[PDB]
Design a binder for this molecule. Structure first.
Ligand SMILES: [Mg+2]
Ligand SMILES: [Zn+2]
Ligand SMILES: [Zn+2]
Lengths: 1335, 307
RNA sequence: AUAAGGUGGGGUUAGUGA
């Protein structure tokens, strides 16, 4: 029916076109009778039939009279629906400014005129005059006048010269403005002002002008004259219980505004003095804006309860304006809600449902089939049949819920598994029964969680339910390929109890031919369950073309392993069950079952292991007891020696031999050590306490204590929690955030004292309070970045490109903390895998890497693969599938259509709750030594020192892969060198953190050049040795008389010649900064690598500040461009630099906060994007200097370290893709044959097709520069204004787009749900292939 | 340092604080000026003959009872029978003045204005006469714009030659035949619009024939009336500007009856305007006591129907 | 199908173990 949404500012006669009348009287209803009046608010003859096809007086009572108006009041007969939308106007007397354009900050009126807003406010509230059309005066056409200086003007140019006040003057002055002279003139003044302030203000000026004329508006419409009134039924008058009436605010202030207007009219009739009508016009001004946006004016207004009433502006904004309140989230029919419970006897493709809720939810279906069978003809018969509960209907809703799916919902619906579908089985009773394996996916414990259900009505949605929403579909997480239908807690207890063995039992080590006999031995009770017996089993495998082959042997095993072997389907190896089967082993068991045997055997296998899980768990009889928790007997003695040790350090403080913090730290360390002694004390006491005979004397084995099974199997808890049970619990923190010196010596099996418990409840309250406010922030994070992505749809097959990023296994600096094969798994490569067989192609360039390929290059020890990423996908308005890869819940390629931006958003969002709250180089393992960006020199001692900070120490193994990474300091004494072999566990470096060395590289003399004692340096003898040294000060301590003098230690030989820099023909001067202590005196001939001077010295919102992309506290300063450097002018707010590039010019220099201890030196020649000092590495310059791939790789390494610190998995594509939504905008560097302004921001896709088809022309396109934006304002910088209108600051984007005249073809999602059509993501992507294909 | 005082009350105090309180004898001084204003416009009313024609005709509407006994008169100074001797006697004065029109004519116009000056009327008749001379100035003004438009904007007549000889007579051909007799080239262009100016000036001669006066004399009547009227309005504005402290002082009482404050102060301003309209100083009371009633009328009226 | 229904305030429920 209709395309794009267009807005514009409102013309006056447009508003006259909208109305059907003028409101004139401030009443609304009778109150005496109950009638609506002639031309009040609730009007009939303006707004229409309050009754239905009937007049007010009831003149035309039938449907026959339809078409003619009445005459006793004059109302047209139509439906009563028509009073919902017929608008009305009011004609105000004196004009009135619209405050959105007045106080959007920046004001459109304000910078449109370029007069300060304070003066406009002085004109508006009548305390000042201002002159239109100055002309022949000594006084300008836009000058404000005070009233005594208007008395002055009243004297002198009190002639034909004119000056007015208020919104009349604003309409007049703003009306008489010519626009084109402003355009050309301000383009000219943009050509004049060298100041970037004036260039900025004038370019905003020229933006609003040249956009203002370009849209078909008029300036003078911005002063409101004819106010539209809202249709009456949307501002309804309801009664409360009794004769009173719950008012609306809107009706109240409409009453106020037309009372105001009419009184002003009669005052103009009576010719009152200017004081009165002045005051009244000011009252009308506050009246009108009090209608528009109450509260943005300096004091709001209240009607009753002294509580500020609601205008129209807050009716849109905020948590209950229409966008988030009634447009994205609506209340729905056909729903029910109650409390969940289990009922484990269900299969997982079905759920329980109560008979009452079923008989309520499906009532129209009952009507339909009940009409079909003819048990009752007419409808109201069926009404009383479904009311009175006759026995036939239980057959009927028994029938119609045969294959009709339903949906379930749990309220904190974080990630998309919170909605799954089931097939209802009717239940006696009235709670909802639920299959157990769904609970972990819902995170819904049975502590009293309620769930809600829904019913898809139509046919296609039933197919969407069974097709996609059905719970058998989703078994893998969208976050990662791990199964989410892992058994939760007690079935793993049962199976862990199944596959175990005490060392001597009934039927110890007999033989058996097949697991059925083992079942007969168990249920006959002739052998124990945990008892080992060599049996015969037989298995299958599909090595061939999926071909299953029988083969068999006599495995030695337990009984119970052979028992649950019967449940396993055909294609498995045996040794999947030949162990104790912890939670991890059964999890990857199910995983490989999915990888090898497809879908359905994994499904029915999972149900069956649930059944035997509860069977043998119940038959097991796993209790707990007070006698089960065992106190280690050594606990008392370890605590005893510990308190002796704090008595020893304490008496060191009694006579004061030690300080406070030293006693503090030693005491807290020995409590840490003794605490650990108690920890492995109780572990060694528990884990293997069972010592028994075995047809012989004695033997130890693992413990049958209930706790150790419950923690060992992975059911609940860990060594930490049982550590808090048996052994002592912890060292609790203090409210300061520091740590208390006396640990909680007791444990929960014994009694805590008073104060240990008191300290503990401090820690607990601080904990769950943090959970409350942390939840509050995490929801806001997801709420934000779901909006900034929102729109990215996999829409094409293959971009056909060769760009992308380079995946490597990451190393923290110690162990590999994330290998290669998971960062690579399931992402199609960029180029082909050259095998490290030299010139062999292992894997071709466009292949999916499933597990076989990953094993293939896994064997050949490939270290790096360039891969296709979504940041490099060349697709306009989308992403090709061959740049994205796998579904991660559907084990294949991604299909065409899946809007993966939101699953990225939920995917990073759901761990937001579970985030946490509260030298030298020593190698470990053995390999070859590798260094990179090395600028080294052999010292006098045979060691190695490196004068480049950017050198990195790596450990290549004996195969070729890197296994360690270490920073090489500027001038660190290395014990070894590059390409060398070391042994694991060897120190290979040395430096001082308490010395920045000013070391050398050559041999010769060092002369005291410019080391003048008192201006640059100072005489500071060493009071400990006697070797006095001339200490070089910094700028702020030395006086200005020799501050421009740079003390240098320049390398000369025995002849004094410039010992040049090795390689070039520049002298080797060592300019001396602050805290540089020149120990080696004058005339001292130096060695290599010797210090000529010595210079000594996070949580969730970290992540939110990374996608916020903030400038950090001080940025690490970096090199804009390659070339040499020097220094700049002394202390000008800061001391400056001077940078001199080699080949091109040297436009770049900068004041530097000299708290930044510099890293580079003057003779150093560097590359762009390289460090000058260090600190936090600001992202914008990584974009603008090191490029696109660098900044993305920086981001994903950063936040991947954050989540990976907590051990919370997320595959890397999601961070990639929302970054591609971050850096979508760009700016212009040159137009070329483009038509854009150079100083203009535009999205990169639109300029990419712009020059891309200017490339189709002979002409050159444009040159661009990309930007990254914080997501909370990147979403505001979007072409679809409704999308930003659903986000924050609705007023700002609404006015700005409103004066823009901007158009919106909707090309996206939440606007397509905001308008109510097919979403263009899933099936509606095929529908928009259709509607796109027509036009 | 005007501290963006977004309360309109605050700045409203800043304006009303300019005028200080007047004593009660200054009210005698100002209401004296008011009596000057209405009395002088009653003099200019008395100097209008068609007021006396329409007066006697409306008296025939009174005794014909095509009007009412209280729709023409509001008592006199120094019962339709008094109106029979007064308007029958005034009919005799009107015919004895009307006979002698062919000097002493204008003396009998003066004495007719004096026997009429005793008379007091219902103010709708005052509306009739103000609008009567008002429309009279609109027709005169129309001929001013017409002959100015055609002679100046058509014949290139200098406005110095227009205002000096033309303005004041406006019905003769003395500016016409004498200005064309000045032998100027604009004056020879005055032959171009002699029809529209002179023949449309014939209705203006008809205006002087209807009123029995020249345009200049009528301009003295209604213009001098306008001087007295503007003077009286200056007095009334001045008194209101005195009594604003009264109206806020009484406005403190009825505040929280479900309405805002400045609504009350404006309604009370209306009420004191009406009280100015209905006060007399020769009564001998202080103004405020009489004013109080009109203020409570405005307030209780306004909150009463604005519940 | 005649139980309907705005605005404030208060109380409660469900939402980690490293
Ligand atoms: Mg719960
Ligand atoms: Zn009617
Ligand atoms: Zn692509």
């Amino acid at each position: 029916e209709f395309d794009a949404i267009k807005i514009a500012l409102a013309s006056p006669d447009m508003i006259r076109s909208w109305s059907f009348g003028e409101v004139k009287k401030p009443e609304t209803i009778n109150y005496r009778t109950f009638k609506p009046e002639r031309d009040g608010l609730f009007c009939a003859r303006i707004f229409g039939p309050v009754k239905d096809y009937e007049c007010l007086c009831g003149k035309y009572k039938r449907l026959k009279h339809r078409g003619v108006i009445c005459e006793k009041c004059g109302v047209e007969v139509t439906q009563t629906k028509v009073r919902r939308e017929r608008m009305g106007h009011i004609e105000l007397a004196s004009p009135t400014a619209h405050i959105w354009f007045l106080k959007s900050l920046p004001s459109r009126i304000g910078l449109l005129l370029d007069m300060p807003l304070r003066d406009i406010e002085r004109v508006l509230y009548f305390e000042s005059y201002v002159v239109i059309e100055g002309g022949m005066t000594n006084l300008e056409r836009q000058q404000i006048l005070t009233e005594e200086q208007y008395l002055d003007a009243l004297e002198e140019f009190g002639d034909e010269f004119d000056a007015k006040m208020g919104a009349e003057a604003i309409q007049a002055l703003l009306k008489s403005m010519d626009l084109e002279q402003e355009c050309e003139q301000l383009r000219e003044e943009l050509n004049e002002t060298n100041s970037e302030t004036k260039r900025k203000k004038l370019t905003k000026r020229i933006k609003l002008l040249e956009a203002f004329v370009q849209s078909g508006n008029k300036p003078e419409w911005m002063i409101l004259t004819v106010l539209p009134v809202l249709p009456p039924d949307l501002r309804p008058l309801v009664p409360l219980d009794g004769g009173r009436f719950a008012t609306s605010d809107l009706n109240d202030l409409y009453r106020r505004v037309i009372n105001r207007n009419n009184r002003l009219k009669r005052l103009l009739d009576l010719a009152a003095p200017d004081i009165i009508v002045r005051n009244e016009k000011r009252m009308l001004q506050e009246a009108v804006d009090a209608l528009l946006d109450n509260g943005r004016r300096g004091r709001a207004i209240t009607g009753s309860n002294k509580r500020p009433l609601k205008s129209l502006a807050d009716m849109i904004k905020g948590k209950q304006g229409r966008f988030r309140q009634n447009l994205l989230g609506k209340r729905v029919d056909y729903s029910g809600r109650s409390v969940i419970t289990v009922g484990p006897y269900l299969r997982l493709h079905q759920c329980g449902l109560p008979k009452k809720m079923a008989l309520e939810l499906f009532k129209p279906f009952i009507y339909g089939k009940l009409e079909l069978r003819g048990l009752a003809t007419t409808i109201k018969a069926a009404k009383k049949m479904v009311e009175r509960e006759e026995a036939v209907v239980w057959d009927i809703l028994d029938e119609v819920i045969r294959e009709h799916p339903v949906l379930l919902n749990r309220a904190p619906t974080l990630h998309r598994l919170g909605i799954q579908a089931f097939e209802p089985v009717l239940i006696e009773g009235k709670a909802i029964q639920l299959h157990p394996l769904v609970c972990a996916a819902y995170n819904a414990d049975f502590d009293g969680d309620q769930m809600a259900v829904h019913v898809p009505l139509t046919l296609e949605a039933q197919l969407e339910a069974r097709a996609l929403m059905m719970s058998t579909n989703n078994i893998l997480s969208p976050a990662n390929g791990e199964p989410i239908i892992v058994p939760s807690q007690d079935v793993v207890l049962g199976l862990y109890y199944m596959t175990r063995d005490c060392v001597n039992a009934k039927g110890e080590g007999m033989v058996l031919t097949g697991p059925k006999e083992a079942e007969r031995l168990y249920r006959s009770g002739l052998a124990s369950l945990h008892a080992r017996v060599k049996v015969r089993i037989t298995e299958y495998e599909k090595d061939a073309n999926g071909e299953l082959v029988a083969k068999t042997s006599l495995k030695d095993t337990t009984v119970g392993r052979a028992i649950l072997w019967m449940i396993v389907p055909k294609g498995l190896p045996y040794s999947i069950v030949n162990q104790a089967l912890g939670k991890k082993a059964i999890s990857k068991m199910l995983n490989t079952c999915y990888r090898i045997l497809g879908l359905k055997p994994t499904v029915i296998f999972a149900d069956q292991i649930m059944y035997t899980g509860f069977a043998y768990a119940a038959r097991s009889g796993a209790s707990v007891g007070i006698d089960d928790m065992v106190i280690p007997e050594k606990k008392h003695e370890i605590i005893s020696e510990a308190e002796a040790e704090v008595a020893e350090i304490q008496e060191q403080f009694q006579s004061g031999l030690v300080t406070a913090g030293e006693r503090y730290n030693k005491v807290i360390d020995i409590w840490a050590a003794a605490n650990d002694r108690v920890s492995k004390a109780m572990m060694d006491n528990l884990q293997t306490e069972t010592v028994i005979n075995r047809d012989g004397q004695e033997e130890k084995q693992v413990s049958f204590n209930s706790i150790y099974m419950m923690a060992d199997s992975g059911a609940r808890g860990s060594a930490a929690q049982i550590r808090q049970l048996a052994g002592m619990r912890g060292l609790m923190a203090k409210p300061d955030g520091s740590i208390i010196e006396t640990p909680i010596t007791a444990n929960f099996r014994e009694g805590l004292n008073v104060l240990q418990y008191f300290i503990s409840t401090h820690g607990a309250r601080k904990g769950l309070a943090d959970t409350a406010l942390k939840t509050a922030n995490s929801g806001y994070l997801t709420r934000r970045l779901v909006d900034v992505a929102q729109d990215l749809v996999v829409t094409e097959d293959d971009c056909g490109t060769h760009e992308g990023i380079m995946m490597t296994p990451v190393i923290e600096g110690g162990d590999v903390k994330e290998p290669l094969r998971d960062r690579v798994l399931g992402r199609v490569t960029a180029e082909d895998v050259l095998k490290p067989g030299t010139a062999d192609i292992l894997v071709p360039r466009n292949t999916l890497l499933h597990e076989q390929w990953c094993d293939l290059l896994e064997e050949n020890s490939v270290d790096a693969v360039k891969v296709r990423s979504v940041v490099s996908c060349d697709t306009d308005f989308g992403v090709c599938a061959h740049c994205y890869g796998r579904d991660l819940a559907r084990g294949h390629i991604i299909n065409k259509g899946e809007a993966i931006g939101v699953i990225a958003a939920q995917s990073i969002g759901e761990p937001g709750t579970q985030l946490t709250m509260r030298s030298s180089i020593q190698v470990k393992n053995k390999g070859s030594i590798k260094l990179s960006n090395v600028k080294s020199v052999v010292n006098s001692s045979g060691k190695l020192v490196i004068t480049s900070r950017n050198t990195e120490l790596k450990l290549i193994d004996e195969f070729g892969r890197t296994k360690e990474s270490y920073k090489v300091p500027y001038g660190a004494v290395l014990a070894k060198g590059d390409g060398e072999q070391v042994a694991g566990g060897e120190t290979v470096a040395n430096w001082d953190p308490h010395t920045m060395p000013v070391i050398t590289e050559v041999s010769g003399f060092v002369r005291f050049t410019d080391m003048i004692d008192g201006q640059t340096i100072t005489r500071q003898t060493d009071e400990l040795t006697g070797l006095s040294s001339l200490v070089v000060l910094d700028s702020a301590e030395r006086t200005a008389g020799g501050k421009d003098l740079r003390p240098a230690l320049k390398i000369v030989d025995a002849q004094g010649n410039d010992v040049l820099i090795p390689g070039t023909d520049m002298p080797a001067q060592y300019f001396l900064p602050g805290k540089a202590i020149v120990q080696l005196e004058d005339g001292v001939q130096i060695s290599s690598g010797d210090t000529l001077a010595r210079i000594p010295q996070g949580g969730l919102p970290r992540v939110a500040d990374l996608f916020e992309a903030r400038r950090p506290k001080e940025p690490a300063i970096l090199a804009e461009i390659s070339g040499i450097v020097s220094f700049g002018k002394e202390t000008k707010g800061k001391r400056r630099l001077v940078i001199t590039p080699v080949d091109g010019s040297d436009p770049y220099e900068e004041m530097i906060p000299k708290w930044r201890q510099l890293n580079v030196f003057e003779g150093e020649r560097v590359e762009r994007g390289d460090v000058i000092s260090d600190g936090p590495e600001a992202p914008h310059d990584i974009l603008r200097l090191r490029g696109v791939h660098a900044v993305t790789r920086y981001i994903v390494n950063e936040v991947q370290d954050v989540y990976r610190l907590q051990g919370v998995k997320i595959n890397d594509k999601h961070i990639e893709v929302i970054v591609r939504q971050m850096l979508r905008k760009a700016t212009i560097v040159n137009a070329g044959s483009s038509d854009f302004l150079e100083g203009e921001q535009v999205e990169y896709s639109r300029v990419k097709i712009a020059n891309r088809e200017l490339e189709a022309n002979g002409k050159v396109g444009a040159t661009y520069s990309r930007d990254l934006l914080g997501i909370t304002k990147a979403s505001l910088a979007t072409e679809s204004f409704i999308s930003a209108a659903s986000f924050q600051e609705t007023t700002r984007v609404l006015t700005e787009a409103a004066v823009a005249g901007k158009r919106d073809e909707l090309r996206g999602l939440k606007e397509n749900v905001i308008v109510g059509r097919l979403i263009p993501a899933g099936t509606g992507y095929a529908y928009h292939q259709d509607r796109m294909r027509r036009r | 340092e005007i501290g963006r005082t977004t309360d309109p009350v605050r700045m409203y105090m800043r304006e009303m604080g300019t005028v200080e309180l007047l004593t009660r004898e200054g009210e005698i001084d100002i209401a004296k000026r008011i009596e000057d204003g209405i009395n002088q416009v009653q003099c200019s009313v008395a100097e209008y003959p068609e007021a006396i024609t329409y007066l006697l005709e409306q008296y025939d509407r009174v005794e014909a009872e095509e009007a009412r006994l209280s729709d023409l008169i509001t008592g006199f100074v120094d019962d339709p029978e008094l109106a029979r001797e007064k308007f029958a006697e005034l009919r005799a004065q009107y015919v004895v003045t009307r006979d002698t029109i062919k000097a002493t004519a204008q003396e009998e116009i003066l004495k007719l204005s004096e026997v009429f000056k005793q008379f007091r009327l219902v103010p709708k008749q005052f509306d009739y006469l103000v609008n009567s001379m008002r429309v009279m100035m609109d027709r005169v003004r129309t001929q001013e714009r017409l002959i100015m438009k055609l002679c100046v904007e058509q014949c290139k007549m200098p406005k110095k030659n227009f205002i000096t000889l033309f303005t004041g007579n406006e019905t003769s051909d003395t500016w016409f035949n004498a200005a064309i007799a000045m032998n100027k080239p604009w004056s020879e262009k005055l032959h171009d619009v002699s029809e529209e100016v002179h023949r449309a000036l014939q209705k203006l001669q008809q205006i002087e024939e209807e009123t029995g006066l020249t345009i200049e004399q009528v301009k003295d009547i209604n213009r001098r009336m306008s001087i007295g009227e503007a003077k009286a309005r200056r007095a009334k504005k001045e008194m209101v500007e005195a009594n604003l402290r009264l109206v806020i002082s009484i406005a403190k009482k009825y505040t929280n009856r479900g309405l805002q404050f400045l609504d009350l102060i404006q309604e009370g301003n209306i009420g004191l305007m009406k009280a100015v309209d209905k006060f007399e100083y020769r009564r001998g009371y202080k103004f405020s006591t009489y004013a109080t009633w009109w203020i409570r009328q405005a307030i209780t009226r306004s909150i009463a129907d604005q519940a």
